[PDB]
Amino acid sequence: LMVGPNFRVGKKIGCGNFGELRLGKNLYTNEYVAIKLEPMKSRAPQLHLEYRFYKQLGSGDGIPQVYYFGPCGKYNAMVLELLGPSLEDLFDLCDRTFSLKTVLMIAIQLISRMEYVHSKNLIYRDVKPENFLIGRPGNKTQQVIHIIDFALAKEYIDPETKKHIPYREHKSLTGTARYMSINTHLGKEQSRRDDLEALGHMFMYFLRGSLPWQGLKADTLKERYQKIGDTKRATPIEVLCENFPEMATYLRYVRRLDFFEKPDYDYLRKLFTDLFDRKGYMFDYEYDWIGKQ
Numbered sequence: 001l002m003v004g005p006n007f008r009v010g011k012k013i014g015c016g017n018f019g020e021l022r023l024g025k026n027l028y029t030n031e032y033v034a035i036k037l038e039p040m041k042s043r044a045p046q047l048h049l050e051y052r053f054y055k056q057l058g059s060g061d062g063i064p065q066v067y068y069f070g071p072c073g074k075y076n077a078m079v080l081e082l083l084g085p086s087l088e089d090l091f092d093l094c095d096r097t098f099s100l101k102t103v104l105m106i107a108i109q110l111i112s113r114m115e116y117v118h119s120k121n122l123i124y125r126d127v128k129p130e131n132f133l134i135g136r137p138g139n140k141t142q143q144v145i146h147i148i149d150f151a152l153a154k155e156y157i158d159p160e161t162k163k164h165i166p167y168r169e170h171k172s173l174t175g176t177a178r179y180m181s182i183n184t185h186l187g188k189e190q191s192r193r194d195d196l197e198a199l200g201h202m203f204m205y206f207l208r209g210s211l212p213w214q215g216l217k218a219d220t221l222k223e224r225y226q227k228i229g230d231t232k233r234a235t236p237i238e239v240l241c242e243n244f245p246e247m248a249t250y251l252r253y254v255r256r257l258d259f260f261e262k263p264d265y266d267y268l269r270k271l272f273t274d275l276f277d278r279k280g281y282m283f284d285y286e287y288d289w290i291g292k293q
């Protein structure tokens, strides 16, 4: 099982949106890589569109490099830069709470990461801790929070018109229920606001250890999502964000954005960098997980 001229496929490492994950090696360069495989027989093929989105991003900071897309036996394969553990993995290592300092270092970076994605005319639509990975150990980039898995992304600027996509409502909801915006639950088309709201939910998950809508079950997926959305609507921001005034300010701001509105990314960063400085924290990448296995 080679992918392309030069990538050897090795052991299983994980799962993502519309594909499975192996360690690989570029034999020509003696460098390890990650390989996502999607069965060619897939009823709902997502890997090639994902490849196109990575190419549209180029590389910015925290964007994994993509090396190859092509067939591999009965699979389509995409070869990516190998990264380190996800924020969910690191959260588990840290007993499922992060310090304010760690959350702020994450948040400052991910506001910028999302601004970059939005600058390439994409919305992300799959915010979750499993999709944010540090770099590799002893790598120049173990400190950097990367974004992966663009299978659910969407162009929000139509390349034909150069205009923002129109507002509309949808039957099917995109993304992870725990983090999605309130408007996502209501079947609205997602836009830039929704990515930033989902980040806010994720930040609060890290600070609190959990979100209050986590334990909800139902007989249908639709009912489950409805109950989660209902709890999000029913939970005041001042309650969710007790003890974190700046998070309350962030969440209120993003929840109140118009569908078409460009977020004030500078404002949101400044909420958090002003807080960071006021607390006497140093931006030294000494996250909670440093010095753990």
Ligand SMILES: Nc1nccc(-c2c(-c3ccc(F)cc3)ncn2[C@H]2CC[C@H](O)CC2)n1
Pocket (backbone or CB within 6 Å): 013, 014, 015, 016, 021, 034, 035, 036, 078, 079, 080, 081, 082, 083, 084, 085, 086, 089, 130, 131, 148, 149
């Ligand atoms: N360590 C690591 N390096 C780069 C990408 C991936 C990864 C990928 C991936 C995406 C597209 C590709 F072409 C290859 C891999 N999808 C999920 N992940 C990780 C998510 C976190 C999980 O605990 C392990 C797998 N993994």
Ligand SMILES: [Cl-]
Pocket (backbone or CB within 6 Å): 008, 009, 010, 011, 023, 024, 025
């Ligand atoms: Cl290997």
